[PDB]
Amino acid sequence: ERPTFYRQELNKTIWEVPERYQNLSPVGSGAYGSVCAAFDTKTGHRVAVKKLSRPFQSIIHAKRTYRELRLLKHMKHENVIGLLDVFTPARSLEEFNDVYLVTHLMGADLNNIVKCQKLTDDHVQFLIYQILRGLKYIHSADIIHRDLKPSNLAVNEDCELKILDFTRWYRAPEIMLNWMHYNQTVDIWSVGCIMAELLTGRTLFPGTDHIDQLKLILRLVGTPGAELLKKISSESARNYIQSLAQMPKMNFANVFIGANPLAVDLLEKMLVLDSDKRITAAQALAHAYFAQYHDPDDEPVADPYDQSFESRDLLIDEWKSLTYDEVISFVPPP
Ligand SMILES: C[S@](=O)c1ccc(-c2nc(-c3ccc(F)cc3)c(-c3ccncc3)[nH]2)cc1
Ligand SMILES: [Mg+2]
Ligand SMILES: [Mg+2]
The missing domain is CATH 1.10.510.10 (Transferase(Phosphotransferase) domain 1)
Structure with missing residues (x-):
C-alpha cells in the first residue's frame, strides 16, 4: 500500500522518490521548485518529477502549495498539465515536510x-x-x-x-x-x-x-x-x-x-x-x-471547481494537513 523510496542528491538537493521512477536528470529549477526528467517503470513513459521548494515556510507558501495540488488534481484536458502521481516520502502528517508532483515529460x-x-x-x-x-x-x-x-x-x-x-x-x-x-x-x-x-x-x-x-x-x-x-x-x-x-x-x-x-x-x-x-x-x-483545427464537439469545458478555500484564513499546520489529505486521496488516470 506504500511503495519503496530511494535517496539521491542532485546538485545540493535531496530527491527521495518511489523506486518505479529511475534515471532522474535535472531539466531546470527556480521559484516554483526543482524538476527532474525520469523513466516511469510502471507506465513505461518519460515523466517530469517536480519537488516543491520550501512548501510550508509561511501561510502564503502552505496555502500556495495546497492551491497548486488542488488545481493540478482538477485538470483533465490535453492542453493542460495532468497529474500522473503525487507522493511524499513522509509516513505520516507529523513528519510531512516535502511534496513531489509527476506529469508526462515535455521536451x-x-x-x-x-x-x-x-x-x-x-x-x-x-x-x-x-x-x-x-x-x-x-x-x-x-x-x-x-x-x-x-x-x-x-x-x-x-x-x-x-x-x-x-x-x-x-x-x-x-x-x-x-x-x-x-x-x-x-x-x-x-x-x-x-x-x-x-x-x-x-x-x-x-x-x-x-x-x-x-x-x-x-x-x-x-x-x-x-x-x-x-x-x-x-x-x-x-x-x-x-x-x-x-x-x-x-x-x-x-x-x-x-x-x-x-x-x-x-x-x-x-x-x-x-x-x-x-x-x-x-x-x-x-x-x-x-478553421483547419476548430471543432466545437472536441473543445470541452471543465467540471465545477471549489475555489471557496481562497477566501479562508488558516495556520500553516492546517494548510499542511489539508495538503496531506489531498496526497493520500489521490487516484491516477485510468
Ligand atoms: C518559472 S517558469 O515560469 C517555469 C515554471 C514551471 C516549469 C515547469 N513545471 C513543470 C512541472 C513538472 C511536474 C509537475 F508535476 C508539474 C509541473 C515542468 C515540466 C513538466 C514536464 N516536462 C518538463 C517540465 N516545467 C517550467 C518553467
Ligand atoms: Mg522546465
Ligand atoms: Mg490535465
Missing part, C-alpha cells in the same frame, strides 16, 4: 519551438489554437492563469502544447495597475503578445518597468477612449493616463506586415485595453484563423 516550451517551425508559419495557428483550447477549459472552471508567458507553455517532439504553474511583457495592462475587476480575458491579452512574438520573432512590448510597459502598450492600441476612461474606478490610474499626451490606435496591418491577414484580425480582437470588448477563448477558437 521544451514556446521559447524553444524548433521542432514545429515551417516557412508559412502555419505552426503558429496550431500552437495558439492549443493555448485557447486549454484556456477555454481553465476559464470554464472560473480559473484565470494571470502570469501567462512562453515558458509557462510546454511542447513535445509532436508539438502537443500544455499550460502549467497557474516578465511583465505579456501582462494585461488592467492587472499591471488595476482599473476594473479584471476578468478571464487578462490571459487572452497574454496570448495576443505570445502569438505576435511567434509571428515577428521580437517581443511585442519589451518594457523596462510598469511606466515603460504602459507607454509601449498605448503606443500600439492608443490611449483609452471616452467610454473606457468612464469604467476606471482608481483615481491614481485615471490621473496617470489622462496626464499623458493622447496616442492614436495604430494600423495592425502596417505593424504586423507580411503576416497572415487572418492572424492580424485575431490580434486586433485580442489586444484591446477594454477587457469587456476583448475576445474570449471560446470566441477566439471559432475565428477563421483556426
Whole structure:
C-alpha cells in the first residue's frame, strides 16, 4: 500500500522518490521548485518529477502549495498539465515536510519551438489554437492563469502544447495597475503578445518597468477612449493616463506586415485595453484563423471547481494537513 523510496542528491538537493521512477536528470529549477526528467517503470513513459521548494515556510507558501495540488488534481484536458502521481516520502502528517508532483515529460516550451517551425508559419495557428483550447477549459472552471508567458507553455517532439504553474511583457495592462475587476480575458491579452512574438520573432512590448510597459502598450492600441476612461474606478490610474499626451490606435496591418491577414484580425480582437470588448477563448477558437483545427464537439469545458478555500484564513499546520489529505486521496488516470 506504500511503495519503496530511494535517496539521491542532485546538485545540493535531496530527491527521495518511489523506486518505479529511475534515471532522474535535472531539466531546470527556480521559484516554483526543482524538476527532474525520469523513466516511469510502471507506465513505461518519460515523466517530469517536480519537488516543491520550501512548501510550508509561511501561510502564503502552505496555502500556495495546497492551491497548486488542488488545481493540478482538477485538470483533465490535453492542453493542460495532468497529474500522473503525487507522493511524499513522509509516513505520516507529523513528519510531512516535502511534496513531489509527476506529469508526462515535455521536451521544451514556446521559447524553444524548433521542432514545429515551417516557412508559412502555419505552426503558429496550431500552437495558439492549443493555448485557447486549454484556456477555454481553465476559464470554464472560473480559473484565470494571470502570469501567462512562453515558458509557462510546454511542447513535445509532436508539438502537443500544455499550460502549467497557474516578465511583465505579456501582462494585461488592467492587472499591471488595476482599473476594473479584471476578468478571464487578462490571459487572452497574454496570448495576443505570445502569438505576435511567434509571428515577428521580437517581443511585442519589451518594457523596462510598469511606466515603460504602459507607454509601449498605448503606443500600439492608443490611449483609452471616452467610454473606457468612464469604467476606471482608481483615481491614481485615471490621473496617470489622462496626464499623458493622447496616442492614436495604430494600423495592425502596417505593424504586423507580411503576416497572415487572418492572424492580424485575431490580434486586433485580442489586444484591446477594454477587457469587456476583448475576445474570449471560446470566441477566439471559432475565428477563421483556426478553421483547419476548430471543432466545437472536441473543445470541452471543465467540471465545477471549489475555489471557496481562497477566501479562508488558516495556520500553516492546517494548510499542511489539508495538503496531506489531498496526497493520500489521490487516484491516477485510468
Ligand atoms: C518559472 S517558469 O515560469 C517555469 C515554471 C514551471 C516549469 C515547469 N513545471 C513543470 C512541472 C513538472 C511536474 C509537475 F508535476 C508539474 C509541473 C515542468 C515540466 C513538466 C514536464 N516536462 C518538463 C517540465 N516545467 C517550467 C518553467
Ligand atoms: Mg522546465
Ligand atoms: Mg490535465
